[PDB]
Symmetry: C2
Subunit: 334 residues, 2 copies
């Protein structure tokens, strides 16, 4: 006979701001061509990557998230006191525990707010953004920080001519909160665990710890499998995201697919049939593939250069590791 | 002028069932404390732990989660096809990527469903349950699997007399779906990022990998500090959870605090002012502290012994690493 109470928050939520942080060190294609048999021109034409950013030895996924969050808050004209929760989405927090979220919250002056780490491969941002919107509309929070951060450089095998030039470091955060009108569309997501090996850490940490003299872990990438999967299936996920958002393809002002490979994204543009003048994120050129931090970093690049503008309707499509994807239509932040 | 659409789902949701998997191997206190000369009785008197289960070498956080989910599905009279998404909460998936969720979904035959891994230290379950409820009410899924799973045994330092006897292995999943009347109360969560070192892996994986000859990483647990914090703060957390759920202390039929210390749980029962005949979860006796899987495993133990019955009003309070906590009032599942 006892009835559990039901709570609810603001139905209309949106991106109040985006803040980005990219490590200082610039690493050129030729800088890694010392241990690989390819060239600078080959890399660019195959991936679209010219340069990449590597974080300093004293930096981590957590420290870069702190920096990204401070910038997002500043750009939103808010402080941690206005934040009710923080979701850190990453794949490079090199500690089984504790999670990064609490320490990140403390570093902003809000050591006590709720928060957790979200891992869904490269698509962690999409899932995190959706979970934040879900929590806020549900009344569990009013304003949140969602920060994608990655320090992939230490996981790269310089001798792997297959991906040594793909991954990079960086972090970008968005402030999610109430907005006059809906700014975040329904979440469209899924996965394919049958191809979980397409992007992976080859040796688990325990197997390594129980035999420290053997081969150490490194990130491996089966290029052909990822290309075939993403290039041919993300078109349909993108249409599902727009449909769920109740928007037509021609109404999309900006397209921000995961910055995994220029060639894959170029095919997605053709497949999605967006307006000929739609702006497409190409932050991969000098940022490389920063996994979970990829789309928020790309959004920031588009906004700081003027290519994209506040209010623009953007199609976000994250795809990657575990072979999971998350997409949604959103209104670009300020 | 374009209006981003808003979707909606079942307003009332609850735990349809719970499924638990406890590895076969029983490990006595002397077995992990054979490397220390401490009293067998002292461990039980101080923490309430007698034995714990350790997973086999061919098992992992992911494989145990899969089995837990199969059982949860069976107990709810549902099939993998009835599941729209799965959230795996753990702190012992020893791979930076790919995440465990896609793999678990594939293994269950729940092809392509959305999913992700959530790490909030030991309180991952409460956060994941709250996220599942939020996603369902938001219309992003109708029925979900939330599974806590941990394989902490490989991270235990047999020579650490401070925590060698604390952690254990196991997994438990719940099915979250629409229900006639609200079954999941509002989420009450938070943390203390300034005490991130209280429970932690002492050496990050990269530092170790760059010095394989040096010391191996292990999970450290500062008992004094963690229990001091728990005793001091969980009482208020429990009250906020009950208040949010609109229920009085005398209305709770089952109390399911994290299984970390029996004495603390006794202290909380009193502080929370629950009825003397309220059933208190003590699965810790032969399960130990299974971190993220602790609460759902404790719910199952209470239900399989008959101590608790489906429909009973229960108070869940998770707390642990990163110094996170997550609590909510819920109706016990099948």
């Amino acid at each position: 006979m006892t009835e559990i109470a039901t709570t609810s928050g603001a139905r209309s939520v949106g991106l109040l701001s985006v803040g980005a942080y990219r490590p200082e060190r610039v690493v050129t294609n030729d800088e890694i061509c010392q241990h690989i048999d390819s060239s600078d021109e080959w890399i660019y034409t195959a991936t679209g990557i010219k340069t990449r950013r590597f974080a300093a030895d004293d930096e981590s996924a957590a420290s870069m998230a702190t920096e990204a969050c401070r910038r997002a808050l500043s750009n939103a004209g808010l402080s941690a006191a206005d934040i009710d929760g923080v979701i850190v989405t990453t794949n490079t927090h090199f500690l089984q525990t504790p999670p990064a979220a609490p320490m990140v919250a403390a570093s902003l002056g809000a050591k006590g707010i709720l928060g957790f780490d979200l891992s869904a491969g490269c698509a962690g941002f999409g899932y995190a953004l959706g979970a934040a919107a879900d929590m806020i509309r549900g009344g569990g929070a009013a304003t949140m920080l969602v920060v994608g951060t990655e320090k992939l450089s230490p996981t790269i095998d310089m001798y792997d001519a297959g991906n040594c030039f793909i991954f990079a470091d960086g972090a970008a955060a968005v402030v999610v909160g109430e907005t006059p009108f809906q700014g975040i569309g329904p979440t469209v997501a899924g996965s394919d665990g049958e191809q979980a090996d397409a992007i992976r850490q080859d040796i688990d940490w325990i197997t390594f710890a129980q035999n420290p003299s053997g081969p150490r872990p490194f990130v491996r990438l089966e290029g052909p499998a990822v290309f075939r999967w993403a290039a041919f299936k993300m078109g349909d996920v993108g249409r599902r995201a727009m449909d769920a958002a109740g928007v037509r393809p021609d109404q999309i002002d900006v397209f921000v697919p995961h910055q995994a490979n220029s060639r894959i994204n170029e095919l997605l543009v053709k497949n999605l049939q967006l307006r000929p003048d739609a702006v497409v994120a190409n932050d991969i050129e000098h940022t490389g593939n920063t996994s979970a931090a990829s789309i928020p970093l790309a959004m920031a690049e588009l906004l700081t250069t003027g290519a994209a503008k506040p209010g623009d309707l953007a199609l976000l499509i994250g795809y990657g590791a575990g072979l999971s994807y998350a997409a949604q239509v959103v209104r670009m932040p300020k």
